[PDB]
mmCIF file with all atom_site columns, all heavy atoms in Angstrom:
data_model
loop_
_atom_site.group_PDB
_atom_site.id
_atom_site.type_symbol
_atom_site.label_atom_id
_atom_site.label_alt_id
_atom_site.label_comp_id
_atom_site.label_asym_id
_atom_site.label_entity_id
_atom_site.label_seq_id
_atom_site.pdbx_PDB_ins_code
_atom_site.Cartn_x
_atom_site.Cartn_y
_atom_site.Cartn_z
_atom_site.occupancy
_atom_site.B_iso_or_equiv
_atom_site.pdbx_formal_charge
_atom_site.auth_seq_id
_atom_site.auth_comp_id
_atom_site.auth_asym_id
_atom_site.auth_atom_id
_atom_site.pdbx_PDB_model_num
ATOM   1   N N   . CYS B 1 1   ? 101.144 32.668 -74.892 1.00 0.00 ? 127 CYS B N   1
ATOM   2   C CA  . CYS B 1 1   ? 102.514 32.835 -74.427 1.00 0.00 ? 127 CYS B CA  1
ATOM   3   C C   . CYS B 1 1   ? 102.546 33.142 -72.948 1.00 0.00 ? 127 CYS B C   1
ATOM   4   O O   . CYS B 1 1   ? 103.313 32.503 -72.234 1.00 0.00 ? 127 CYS B O   1
ATOM   5   C CB  . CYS B 1 1   ? 103.247 33.909 -75.224 1.00 0.00 ? 127 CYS B CB  1
ATOM   6   S SG  . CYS B 1 1   ? 104.928 34.263 -74.626 1.00 0.00 ? 127 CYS B SG  1
ATOM   7   N N   . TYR B 1 153 ? 112.866 51.792 -68.397 1.00 0.00 ? 279 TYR B N   1
ATOM   8   C CA  . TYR B 1 153 ? 111.719 51.279 -69.124 1.00 0.00 ? 279 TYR B CA  1
ATOM   9   C C   . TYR B 1 153 ? 110.444 51.518 -68.319 1.00 0.00 ? 279 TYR B C   1
ATOM   10  O O   . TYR B 1 153 ? 110.056 50.674 -67.508 1.00 0.00 ? 279 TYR B O   1
ATOM   11  C CB  . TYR B 1 153 ? 111.958 49.773 -69.379 1.00 0.00 ? 279 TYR B CB  1
ATOM   12  C CG  . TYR B 1 153 ? 110.984 49.068 -70.304 1.00 0.00 ? 279 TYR B CG  1
ATOM   13  C CD1 . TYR B 1 153 ? 111.023 49.270 -71.681 1.00 0.00 ? 279 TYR B CD1 1
ATOM   14  C CD2 . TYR B 1 153 ? 110.131 48.079 -69.821 1.00 0.00 ? 279 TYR B CD2 1
ATOM   15  C CE1 . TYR B 1 153 ? 110.170 48.579 -72.544 1.00 0.00 ? 279 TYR B CE1 1
ATOM   16  C CE2 . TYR B 1 153 ? 109.271 47.381 -70.675 1.00 0.00 ? 279 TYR B CE2 1
ATOM   17  C CZ  . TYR B 1 153 ? 109.296 47.629 -72.037 1.00 0.00 ? 279 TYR B CZ  1
ATOM   18  O OH  . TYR B 1 153 ? 108.433 46.953 -72.874 1.00 0.00 ? 279 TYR B OH  1
ATOM   19  N N   . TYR B 1 180 ? 107.389 49.802 -76.828 1.00 0.00 ? 306 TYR B N   1
ATOM   20  C CA  . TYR B 1 180 ? 107.437 48.356 -77.045 1.00 0.00 ? 306 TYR B CA  1
ATOM   21  C C   . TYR B 1 180 ? 106.106 47.715 -76.724 1.00 0.00 ? 306 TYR B C   1
ATOM   22  O O   . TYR B 1 180 ? 105.401 48.263 -75.877 1.00 0.00 ? 306 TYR B O   1
ATOM   23  C CB  . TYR B 1 180 ? 108.509 47.733 -76.148 1.00 0.00 ? 306 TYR B CB  1
ATOM   24  C CG  . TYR B 1 180 ? 109.923 48.059 -76.549 1.00 0.00 ? 306 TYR B CG  1
ATOM   25  C CD1 . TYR B 1 180 ? 110.577 49.170 -76.026 1.00 0.00 ? 306 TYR B CD1 1
ATOM   26  C CD2 . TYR B 1 180 ? 110.647 47.203 -77.369 1.00 0.00 ? 306 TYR B CD2 1
ATOM   27  C CE1 . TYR B 1 180 ? 111.896 49.458 -76.363 1.00 0.00 ? 306 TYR B CE1 1
ATOM   28  C CE2 . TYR B 1 180 ? 111.976 47.465 -77.693 1.00 0.00 ? 306 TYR B CE2 1
ATOM   29  C CZ  . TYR B 1 180 ? 112.589 48.610 -77.213 1.00 0.00 ? 306 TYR B CZ  1
ATOM   30  O OH  . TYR B 1 180 ? 113.902 48.871 -77.542 1.00 0.00 ? 306 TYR B OH  1
ATOM   31  N N   . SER B 1 183 ? 103.271 42.560 -74.751 1.00 0.00 ? 309 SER B N   1
ATOM   32  C CA  . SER B 1 183 ? 103.505 41.155 -75.103 1.00 0.00 ? 309 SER B CA  1
ATOM   33  C C   . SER B 1 183 ? 104.953 40.759 -74.969 1.00 0.00 ? 309 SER B C   1
ATOM   34  O O   . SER B 1 183 ? 105.270 39.575 -74.880 1.00 0.00 ? 309 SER B O   1
ATOM   35  C CB  . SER B 1 183 ? 103.065 40.901 -76.543 1.00 0.00 ? 309 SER B CB  1
ATOM   36  O OG  . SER B 1 183 ? 101.804 41.468 -76.886 1.00 0.00 ? 309 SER B OG  1
ATOM   37  N N   . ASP B 1 184 ? 105.819 41.754 -74.976 1.00 0.00 ? 310 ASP B N   1
ATOM   38  C CA  . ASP B 1 184 ? 107.242 41.572 -74.822 1.00 0.00 ? 310 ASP B CA  1
ATOM   39  C C   . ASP B 1 184 ? 107.614 41.132 -73.410 1.00 0.00 ? 310 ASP B C   1
ATOM   40  O O   . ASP B 1 184 ? 108.691 40.565 -73.228 1.00 0.00 ? 310 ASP B O   1
ATOM   41  C CB  . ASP B 1 184 ? 107.982 42.852 -75.191 1.00 0.00 ? 310 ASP B CB  1
ATOM   42  C CG  . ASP B 1 184 ? 108.523 42.818 -76.600 1.00 0.00 ? 310 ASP B CG  1
ATOM   43  O OD1 . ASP B 1 184 ? 107.961 42.062 -77.440 1.00 0.00 ? 310 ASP B OD1 1
ATOM   44  O OD2 . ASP B 1 184 ? 109.512 43.533 -76.869 1.00 0.00 ? 310 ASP B OD2 1
ATOM   45  N N   . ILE B 1 185 ? 106.767 41.426 -72.409 1.00 0.00 ? 311 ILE B N   1
ATOM   46  C CA  . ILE B 1 185 ? 106.990 41.004 -71.024 1.00 0.00 ? 311 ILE B CA  1
ATOM   47  C C   . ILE B 1 185 ? 105.657 40.548 -70.506 1.00 0.00 ? 311 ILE B C   1
ATOM   48  O O   . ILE B 1 185 ? 104.893 41.368 -69.973 1.00 0.00 ? 311 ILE B O   1
ATOM   49  C CB  . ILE B 1 185 ? 107.659 42.026 -70.076 1.00 0.00 ? 311 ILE B CB  1
ATOM   50  C CG1 . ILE B 1 185 ? 108.221 43.264 -70.818 1.00 0.00 ? 311 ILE B CG1 1
ATOM   51  C CG2 . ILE B 1 185 ? 108.714 41.329 -69.225 1.00 0.00 ? 311 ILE B CG2 1
ATOM   52  C CD1 . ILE B 1 185 ? 107.135 44.367 -71.229 1.00 0.00 ? 311 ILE B CD1 1
ATOM   53  N N   . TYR B 1 193 ? 108.983 39.589 -61.477 1.00 0.00 ? 319 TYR B N   1
ATOM   54  C CA  . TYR B 1 193 ? 109.775 40.810 -61.376 1.00 0.00 ? 319 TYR B CA  1
ATOM   55  C C   . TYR B 1 193 ? 109.388 41.599 -60.165 1.00 0.00 ? 319 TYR B C   1
ATOM   56  O O   . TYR B 1 193 ? 110.148 42.444 -59.716 1.00 0.00 ? 319 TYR B O   1
ATOM   57  C CB  . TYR B 1 193 ? 109.605 41.649 -62.638 1.00 0.00 ? 319 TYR B CB  1
ATOM   58  C CG  . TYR B 1 193 ? 110.302 41.022 -63.823 1.00 0.00 ? 319 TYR B CG  1
ATOM   59  C CD1 . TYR B 1 193 ? 109.750 39.940 -64.496 1.00 0.00 ? 319 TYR B CD1 1
ATOM   60  C CD2 . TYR B 1 193 ? 111.528 41.517 -64.272 1.00 0.00 ? 319 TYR B CD2 1
ATOM   61  C CE1 . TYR B 1 193 ? 110.407 39.328 -65.555 1.00 0.00 ? 319 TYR B CE1 1
ATOM   62  C CE2 . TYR B 1 193 ? 112.200 40.911 -65.334 1.00 0.00 ? 319 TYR B CE2 1
ATOM   63  C CZ  . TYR B 1 193 ? 111.631 39.818 -65.974 1.00 0.00 ? 319 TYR B CZ  1
ATOM   64  O OH  . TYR B 1 193 ? 112.278 39.181 -66.998 1.00 0.00 ? 319 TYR B OH  1
ATOM   65  N N   . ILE B 1 201 ? 121.375 38.144 -66.442 1.00 0.00 ? 327 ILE B N   1
ATOM   66  C CA  . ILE B 1 201 ? 121.841 37.102 -67.339 1.00 0.00 ? 327 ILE B CA  1
ATOM   67  C C   . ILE B 1 201 ? 123.309 37.434 -67.573 1.00 0.00 ? 327 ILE B C   1
ATOM   68  O O   . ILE B 1 201 ? 123.628 38.527 -68.052 1.00 0.00 ? 327 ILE B O   1
ATOM   69  C CB  . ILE B 1 201 ? 121.014 36.957 -68.647 1.00 0.00 ? 327 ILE B CB  1
ATOM   70  C CG1 . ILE B 1 201 ? 119.522 36.726 -68.328 1.00 0.00 ? 327 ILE B CG1 1
ATOM   71  C CG2 . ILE B 1 201 ? 121.568 35.800 -69.504 1.00 0.00 ? 327 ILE B CG2 1
ATOM   72  C CD1 . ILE B 1 201 ? 118.523 37.249 -69.356 1.00 0.00 ? 327 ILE B CD1 1
ATOM   73  N N   . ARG B 1 231 ? 118.730 31.331 -61.496 1.00 0.00 ? 357 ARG B N   1
ATOM   74  C CA  . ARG B 1 231 ? 117.608 30.861 -62.300 1.00 0.00 ? 357 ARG B CA  1
ATOM   75  C C   . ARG B 1 231 ? 117.897 30.938 -63.787 1.00 0.00 ? 357 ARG B C   1
ATOM   76  O O   . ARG B 1 231 ? 118.502 31.901 -64.244 1.00 0.00 ? 357 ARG B O   1
ATOM   77  C CB  . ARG B 1 231 ? 116.364 31.694 -61.976 1.00 0.00 ? 357 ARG B CB  1
ATOM   78  C CG  . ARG B 1 231 ? 115.049 31.032 -62.370 1.00 0.00 ? 357 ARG B CG  1
ATOM   79  C CD  . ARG B 1 231 ? 113.834 31.859 -61.989 1.00 0.00 ? 357 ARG B CD  1
ATOM   80  N NE  . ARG B 1 231 ? 113.853 33.168 -62.633 1.00 0.00 ? 357 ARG B NE  1
ATOM   81  C CZ  . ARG B 1 231 ? 113.380 33.418 -63.846 1.00 0.00 ? 357 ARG B CZ  1
ATOM   82  N NH1 . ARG B 1 231 ? 112.821 32.448 -64.562 1.00 0.00 ? 357 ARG B NH1 1
ATOM   83  N NH2 . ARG B 1 231 ? 113.454 34.637 -64.351 1.00 0.00 ? 357 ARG B NH2 1
ATOM   84  N N   . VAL B 1 233 ? 116.641 31.611 -67.288 1.00 0.00 ? 359 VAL B N   1
ATOM   85  C CA  . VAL B 1 233 ? 115.578 32.426 -67.892 1.00 0.00 ? 359 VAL B CA  1
ATOM   86  C C   . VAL B 1 233 ? 114.935 31.704 -69.073 1.00 0.00 ? 359 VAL B C   1
ATOM   87  O O   . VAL B 1 233 ? 115.480 30.715 -69.593 1.00 0.00 ? 359 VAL B O   1
ATOM   88  C CB  . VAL B 1 233 ? 116.044 33.849 -68.316 1.00 0.00 ? 359 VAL B CB  1
ATOM   89  C CG1 . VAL B 1 233 ? 116.194 34.769 -67.111 1.00 0.00 ? 359 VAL B CG1 1
ATOM   90  C CG2 . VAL B 1 233 ? 117.320 33.806 -69.158 1.00 0.00 ? 359 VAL B CG2 1
ATOM   91  N N   . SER B 1 234 ? 113.767 32.233 -69.489 1.00 0.00 ? 360 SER B N   1
ATOM   92  C CA  . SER B 1 234 ? 112.962 31.758 -70.603 1.00 0.00 ? 360 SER B CA  1
ATOM   93  C C   . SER B 1 234 ? 113.765 31.737 -71.902 1.00 0.00 ? 360 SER B C   1
ATOM   94  O O   . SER B 1 234 ? 114.536 32.665 -72.167 1.00 0.00 ? 360 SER B O   1
ATOM   95  C CB  . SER B 1 234 ? 111.729 32.641 -70.771 1.00 0.00 ? 360 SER B CB  1
ATOM   96  O OG  . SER B 1 234 ? 110.874 32.184 -71.807 1.00 0.00 ? 360 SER B OG  1
ATOM   97  N N   . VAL B 1 236 ? 112.434 31.921 -74.815 1.00 0.00 ? 362 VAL B N   1
ATOM   98  C CA  . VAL B 1 236 ? 111.680 32.891 -75.604 1.00 0.00 ? 362 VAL B CA  1
ATOM   99  C C   . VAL B 1 236 ? 112.455 34.213 -75.535 1.00 0.00 ? 362 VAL B C   1
ATOM   100 O O   . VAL B 1 236 ? 112.745 34.822 -76.568 1.00 0.00 ? 362 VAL B O   1
ATOM   101 C CB  . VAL B 1 236 ? 110.219 33.027 -75.072 1.00 0.00 ? 362 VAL B CB  1
ATOM   102 C CG1 . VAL B 1 236 ? 109.431 34.051 -75.874 1.00 0.00 ? 362 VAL B CG1 1
ATOM   103 C CG2 . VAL B 1 236 ? 109.494 31.682 -75.064 1.00 0.00 ? 362 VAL B CG2 1
ATOM   104 N N   . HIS B 1 237 ? 112.867 34.578 -74.294 1.00 0.00 ? 363 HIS B N   1
ATOM   105 C CA  . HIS B 1 237 ? 113.638 35.778 -73.978 1.00 0.00 ? 363 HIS B CA  1
ATOM   106 C C   . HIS B 1 237 ? 115.101 35.651 -74.413 1.00 0.00 ? 363 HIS B C   1
ATOM   107 O O   . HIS B 1 237 ? 115.670 36.632 -74.890 1.00 0.00 ? 363 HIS B O   1
ATOM   108 C CB  . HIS B 1 237 ? 113.561 36.114 -72.473 1.00 0.00 ? 363 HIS B CB  1
ATOM   109 C CG  . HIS B 1 237 ? 114.351 37.336 -72.094 1.00 0.00 ? 363 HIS B CG  1
ATOM   110 N ND1 . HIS B 1 237 ? 114.050 38.591 -72.625 1.00 0.00 ? 363 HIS B ND1 1
ATOM   111 C CD2 . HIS B 1 237 ? 115.428 37.452 -71.280 1.00 0.00 ? 363 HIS B CD2 1
ATOM   112 C CE1 . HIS B 1 237 ? 114.946 39.420 -72.109 1.00 0.00 ? 363 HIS B CE1 1
ATOM   113 N NE2 . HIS B 1 237 ? 115.791 38.782 -71.288 1.00 0.00 ? 363 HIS B NE2 1
ATOM   114 N N   . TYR B 1 240 ? 115.479 36.338 -78.036 1.00 0.00 ? 366 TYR B N   1
ATOM   115 C CA  . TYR B 1 240 ? 115.106 37.747 -78.178 1.00 0.00 ? 366 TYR B CA  1
ATOM   116 C C   . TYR B 1 240 ? 116.312 38.654 -77.893 1.00 0.00 ? 366 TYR B C   1
ATOM   117 O O   . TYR B 1 240 ? 116.585 39.551 -78.692 1.00 0.00 ? 366 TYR B O   1
ATOM   118 C CB  . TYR B 1 240 ? 113.909 38.078 -77.254 1.00 0.00 ? 366 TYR B CB  1
ATOM   119 C CG  . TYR B 1 240 ? 113.510 39.537 -77.171 1.00 0.00 ? 366 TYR B CG  1
ATOM   120 C CD1 . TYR B 1 240 ? 113.277 40.286 -78.323 1.00 0.00 ? 366 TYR B CD1 1
ATOM   121 C CD2 . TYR B 1 240 ? 113.269 40.141 -75.938 1.00 0.00 ? 366 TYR B CD2 1
ATOM   122 C CE1 . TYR B 1 240 ? 112.883 41.619 -78.253 1.00 0.00 ? 366 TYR B CE1 1
ATOM   123 C CE2 . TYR B 1 240 ? 112.863 41.470 -75.854 1.00 0.00 ? 366 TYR B CE2 1
ATOM   124 C CZ  . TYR B 1 240 ? 112.669 42.206 -77.016 1.00 0.00 ? 366 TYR B CZ  1
ATOM   125 O OH  . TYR B 1 240 ? 112.256 43.518 -76.956 1.00 0.00 ? 366 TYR B OH  1
ATOM   126 N N   . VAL B 1 251 ? 118.530 43.584 -64.936 1.00 0.00 ? 377 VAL B N   1
ATOM   127 C CA  . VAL B 1 251 ? 117.220 44.261 -64.897 1.00 0.00 ? 377 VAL B CA  1
ATOM   128 C C   . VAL B 1 251 ? 116.658 44.451 -63.457 1.00 0.00 ? 377 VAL B C   1
ATOM   129 O O   . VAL B 1 251 ? 116.148 43.516 -62.823 1.00 0.00 ? 377 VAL B O   1
ATOM   130 C CB  . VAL B 1 251 ? 116.209 43.515 -65.818 1.00 0.00 ? 377 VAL B CB  1
ATOM   131 C CG1 . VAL B 1 251 ? 114.803 44.112 -65.745 1.00 0.00 ? 377 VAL B CG1 1
ATOM   132 C CG2 . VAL B 1 251 ? 116.716 43.478 -67.266 1.00 0.00 ? 377 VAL B CG2 1
ATOM   133 N N   . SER B 1 265 ? 116.434 48.226 -67.153 1.00 0.00 ? 391 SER B N   1
ATOM   134 C CA  . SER B 1 265 ? 117.019 47.231 -68.049 1.00 0.00 ? 391 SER B CA  1
ATOM   135 C C   . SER B 1 265 ? 118.420 47.658 -68.440 1.00 0.00 ? 391 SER B C   1
ATOM   136 O O   . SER B 1 265 ? 118.670 48.851 -68.633 1.00 0.00 ? 391 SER B O   1
ATOM   137 C CB  . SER B 1 265 ? 116.154 47.016 -69.287 1.00 0.00 ? 391 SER B CB  1
ATOM   138 O OG  . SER B 1 265 ? 116.669 45.975 -70.098 1.00 0.00 ? 391 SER B OG  1
ATOM   139 N N   . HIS B 1 267 ? 122.109 46.454 -70.771 1.00 0.00 ? 393 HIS B N   1
ATOM   140 C CA  . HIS B 1 267 ? 122.657 45.720 -71.895 1.00 0.00 ? 393 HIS B CA  1
ATOM   141 C C   . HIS B 1 267 ? 124.162 45.800 -71.935 1.00 0.00 ? 393 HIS B C   1
ATOM   142 O O   . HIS B 1 267 ? 124.739 46.892 -71.901 1.00 0.00 ? 393 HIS B O   1
ATOM   143 C CB  . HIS B 1 267 ? 122.067 46.255 -73.212 1.00 0.00 ? 393 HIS B CB  1
ATOM   144 C CG  . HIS B 1 267 ? 120.746 45.661 -73.592 1.00 0.00 ? 393 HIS B CG  1
ATOM   145 N ND1 . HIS B 1 267 ? 119.997 44.912 -72.695 1.00 0.00 ? 393 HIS B ND1 1
ATOM   146 C CD2 . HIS B 1 267 ? 120.078 45.734 -74.763 1.00 0.00 ? 393 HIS B CD2 1
ATOM   147 C CE1 . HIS B 1 267 ? 118.913 44.547 -73.352 1.00 0.00 ? 393 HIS B CE1 1
ATOM   148 N NE2 . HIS B 1 267 ? 118.914 45.020 -74.600 1.00 0.00 ? 393 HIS B NE2 1
HETATM 149 C C1  . BLA C 2 .   ? 106.269 35.361 -75.223 1.00 0.00 ? 168 BLA C C1  1
HETATM 150 C C2  . BLA C 2 .   ? 106.445 36.648 -75.453 1.00 0.00 ? 168 BLA C C2  1
HETATM 151 C C3  . BLA C 2 .   ? 107.728 37.324 -75.690 1.00 0.00 ? 168 BLA C C3  1
HETATM 152 C C4  . BLA C 2 .   ? 108.162 38.027 -76.787 1.00 0.00 ? 168 BLA C C4  1
HETATM 153 C C5  . BLA C 2 .   ? 107.523 38.215 -78.132 1.00 0.00 ? 168 BLA C C5  1
HETATM 154 C C6  . BLA C 2 .   ? 109.452 38.629 -76.488 1.00 0.00 ? 168 BLA C C6  1
HETATM 155 O O1  . BLA C 2 .   ? 110.146 39.340 -77.219 1.00 0.00 ? 168 BLA C O1  1
HETATM 156 N N1  . BLA C 2 .   ? 109.780 38.258 -75.190 1.00 0.00 ? 168 BLA C N1  1
HETATM 157 C C7  . BLA C 2 .   ? 108.800 37.458 -74.639 1.00 0.00 ? 168 BLA C C7  1
HETATM 158 C C8  . BLA C 2 .   ? 108.814 36.873 -73.385 1.00 0.00 ? 168 BLA C C8  1
HETATM 159 C C9  . BLA C 2 .   ? 109.533 37.151 -72.195 1.00 0.00 ? 168 BLA C C9  1
HETATM 160 N N2  . BLA C 2 .   ? 110.261 38.281 -71.969 1.00 0.00 ? 168 BLA C N2  1
HETATM 161 C C10 . BLA C 2 .   ? 110.766 38.163 -70.689 1.00 0.00 ? 168 BLA C C10 1
HETATM 162 C C11 . BLA C 2 .   ? 111.625 39.099 -69.964 1.00 0.00 ? 168 BLA C C11 1
HETATM 163 C C12 . BLA C 2 .   ? 111.994 40.448 -70.345 1.00 0.00 ? 168 BLA C C12 1
HETATM 164 N N3  . BLA C 2 .   ? 111.486 41.033 -71.434 1.00 0.00 ? 168 BLA C N3  1
HETATM 165 C C13 . BLA C 2 .   ? 112.023 42.261 -71.399 1.00 0.00 ? 168 BLA C C13 1
HETATM 166 C C14 . BLA C 2 .   ? 111.711 43.293 -72.379 1.00 0.00 ? 168 BLA C C14 1
HETATM 167 C C15 . BLA C 2 .   ? 112.768 44.134 -72.940 1.00 0.00 ? 168 BLA C C15 1
HETATM 168 N N4  . BLA C 2 .   ? 114.053 43.912 -72.634 1.00 0.00 ? 168 BLA C N4  1
HETATM 169 C C16 . BLA C 2 .   ? 114.693 44.842 -73.356 1.00 0.00 ? 168 BLA C C16 1
HETATM 170 O O2  . BLA C 2 .   ? 115.942 44.987 -73.371 1.00 0.00 ? 168 BLA C O2  1
HETATM 171 C C17 . BLA C 2 .   ? 113.857 45.717 -74.177 1.00 0.00 ? 168 BLA C C17 1
HETATM 172 C C18 . BLA C 2 .   ? 114.257 46.823 -75.069 1.00 0.00 ? 168 BLA C C18 1
HETATM 173 C C19 . BLA C 2 .   ? 115.534 47.109 -75.205 1.00 0.00 ? 168 BLA C C19 1
HETATM 174 C C20 . BLA C 2 .   ? 112.518 45.246 -73.874 1.00 0.00 ? 168 BLA C C20 1
HETATM 175 C C21 . BLA C 2 .   ? 111.215 45.740 -74.439 1.00 0.00 ? 168 BLA C C21 1
HETATM 176 C C22 . BLA C 2 .   ? 112.889 42.558 -70.245 1.00 0.00 ? 168 BLA C C22 1
HETATM 177 C C23 . BLA C 2 .   ? 113.615 43.835 -69.939 1.00 0.00 ? 168 BLA C C23 1
HETATM 178 C C24 . BLA C 2 .   ? 112.859 41.292 -69.510 1.00 0.00 ? 168 BLA C C24 1
HETATM 179 C C25 . BLA C 2 .   ? 113.550 40.911 -68.241 1.00 0.00 ? 168 BLA C C25 1
HETATM 180 C C26 . BLA C 2 .   ? 114.944 40.505 -68.616 1.00 0.00 ? 168 BLA C C26 1
HETATM 181 C C27 . BLA C 2 .   ? 115.466 39.657 -67.486 1.00 0.00 ? 168 BLA C C27 1
HETATM 182 O O3  . BLA C 2 .   ? 115.707 40.303 -66.385 1.00 0.00 ? 168 BLA C O3  1
HETATM 183 O O4  . BLA C 2 .   ? 115.661 38.472 -67.591 1.00 0.00 ? 168 BLA C O4  1
HETATM 184 C C28 . BLA C 2 .   ? 110.338 36.907 -70.095 1.00 0.00 ? 168 BLA C C28 1
HETATM 185 C C29 . BLA C 2 .   ? 110.688 36.412 -68.715 1.00 0.00 ? 168 BLA C C29 1
HETATM 186 C C30 . BLA C 2 .   ? 111.961 35.571 -68.675 1.00 0.00 ? 168 BLA C C30 1
HETATM 187 C C31 . BLA C 2 .   ? 112.494 35.310 -67.294 1.00 0.00 ? 168 BLA C C31 1
HETATM 188 O O5  . BLA C 2 .   ? 113.094 36.151 -66.648 1.00 0.00 ? 168 BLA C O5  1
HETATM 189 O O6  . BLA C 2 .   ? 112.285 34.084 -66.854 1.00 0.00 ? 168 BLA C O6  1
HETATM 190 C C32 . BLA C 2 .   ? 109.559 36.274 -71.039 1.00 0.00 ? 168 BLA C C32 1
HETATM 191 C C33 . BLA C 2 .   ? 108.849 34.956 -70.937 1.00 0.00 ? 168 BLA C C33 1
#
Side-chain angles (χ1 to χ4, degrees):
Chain B
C127 176
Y279 189 74
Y306 289 91
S309 315
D310 262 25
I311 350 79
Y319 289 77
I327 304 150
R357 200 178 60 86
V359 284
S360 183
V362 179
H363 179 62
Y366 173 52
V377 176
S391 185
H393 275 13

